[PDB]
Design a protein around this ligand. Structure first.
Ligand SMILES: [Fe+2]
Ligand SMILES: [Fe+2]
Ligand SMILES: [Fe+2]
Ligand SMILES: [Fe+2]
Lengths: 321, 321
């Protein structure tokens, strides 16, 4: 089931916005934005593109360079490096992969939303370069960008995230599309969140609160990104039920469980109970709470039915802007 | 010469920013933005992404709906429709094609700049939908989006712009890459500029000055877009001289001349000497002046050596924000 990439202009395209599909539609590829079939796509474009606009270099980085230099434990510095190294990798993969999704989507408003998302991932990449230029020395910043070259746990996370995307790239069929889409949702649902919790920990004890400002903006973006793919997956289920074979529906629950498992083993490798305010048990229930939250939001039963409340419920108010 | 699309993560990638190439480089595809080989790419990202940020819906559209309703000649309304219809088509093609360029570029800072450009093209698409929702009735706005369905001159412009891009899409080789790149530069250099001159005409007689506000923002964006591809083409010439065969170098001067010719035949079909302040002769020298300006900026002799001054030199000060 080989998804063609639409031609640049289709004079035999449907005039009728009502006939749009997320995939395999018959558009003109003119952005006929006087009629919107997916109001969520256009609302999310306006939210990411205009409402939540932000400039990383307008966040003051006056203090963090000192707190790093003298006030951070050797464990806090290790975490800082690992977390920032991995988030740099994630946002790099996303800038690139979202171009693959956008060029396959046949609904203009959804392509618009994906373009805005791609742009926000580029802003994140700008934010990390600004965080490091401000906070650390030049060889150290190079080392953090390159830390996968020294840390096999980090290298293996990266190769694994790339694996799911490269199957679709190399073999661009409907199956490999749904799995990439699910992989995107998992990556935005889960893989930021050991990282975010750790920064909001450092920050609730008044450490690296400049870095934490940057992180709050990134995390606002990532909730919009999660919402966008939630809608794409749930609309894809309605519009293309053939694609959610029982094999696929099973795999979705396998990967979501694996993914929850790994984010926890990273959360714990990063921290190692050496970070005041977070331990290996709190981590486990955060990621399992997030897993159920996100797999149910896309039409599945909880995967960790024991967990029902959010261990870190304080983050919801801290992370607000 | 078949340009592979880089894999999502390359652990065998060069660590050394100095070794980046615009195409056919060997990157990790981690955005290692602590070292920038192409300062112009990163400066242009910051300029498009942060400095020149703008929100179309924050431009007041109080007057234009009335001026359209009563004050615009039947010829002024025809132009308005044709110009806006064609710019909607251009910006649609660009949002989509820039995803093709970004996924082929191996220098992260240039991919960043292309992402920002893609995002600005989406903002333009938002601007046109806002211009029409404000200025005209719902069936008329649909008609303007769809005007290629009624006007064979407009349909043929569209199919022609798509042709150059689809060769690269269908046959993604080095030759078809350079021609697409040149086509992008021509489209941003020329194909906006009958349209821009016409709006700044309407606007120097105090007609549709709200539309003209929107247009000034779009035209600031398009000058950054022209600069970006100027640099890409001139860097591609240094880095890949094999690709600028004499066949190619000849074709570049053919298409640039054709393209100047067509933009004039559109400029004249749109207006028809029925627009106070612009005639078929002024058009001819504007587009020929722009042609030399842009083909020389990418290492060629003037193509209209008779023309040396800019007929509409007043636009440079009018269009400023
Ligand atoms: Fe991000
Ligand atoms: Fe994201
Ligand atoms: Fe545009
Ligand atoms: Fe443009």
């Amino acid at each position: 089931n080989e998804l063609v990439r639409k031609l640049i202009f289709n004079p035999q395209g449907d005039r009728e916005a009502s006939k749009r599909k997320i995939i395999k539609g018959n558009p003109t590829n003119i952005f006929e934005l006087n009629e919107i079939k997916y109001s969520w796509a256009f609302d999310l474009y306006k939210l990411m593109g205009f409402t939540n606009f932000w400039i990383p270099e307008e966040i003051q980085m006056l203090e963090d360079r000192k707190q790093y230099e003298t006030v951070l434990s050797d464990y806090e510095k290790r975490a800082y490096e690992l977390v920032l190294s991995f988030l740099i990798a994630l946002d790099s993969f996303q800038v690139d992969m979202l171009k693959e999704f956008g060029r396959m989507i046949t609904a203009p408003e959804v392509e618009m939303a994906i373009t805005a998302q791609e742009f926000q991932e580029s802003v994140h990449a700008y934010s990390y370069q600004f965080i490091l230029e401000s906070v650390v020395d030049p060889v150290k910043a190079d080392e953090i960008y390159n830390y996968w070259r020294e840390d096999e746990r980090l290298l293996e996370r990266n190769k694994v995230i790339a694996e799911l995307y490269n199957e679709f790239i190399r073999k661009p069929n409907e199956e490999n599309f749904i799995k990439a889409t699910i992989g995107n949702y998992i990556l935005e649902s889960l893989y930021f969140y050991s990282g975010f919790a750790f920064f909001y920990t450092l920050g609730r004890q008044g450490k690296m609160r400049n870095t934490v400002q940057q992180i709050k903006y990134i995390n606002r973006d990532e909730l919009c990104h999660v919402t966008l793919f939630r809608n794409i997956i749930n609309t894809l289920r309605k519009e293309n039920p053939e694609l959610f074979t029982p094999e696929i529906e099973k795999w979705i629950v396998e990967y979501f469980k694996y993914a929850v498992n790994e984010e926890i083993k990273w959360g714990q490798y990063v921290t190692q109970n050496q970070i005041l305010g977070i331990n290996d048990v709190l981590i486990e229930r955060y990621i399992k709470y997030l897993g159920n939250l996100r797999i149910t939001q896309i039409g599945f039963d909880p995967i960790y039915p024991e967990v029902t409340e959010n261990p870190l419920k304080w983050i919801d108010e801290f992370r607000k802007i």
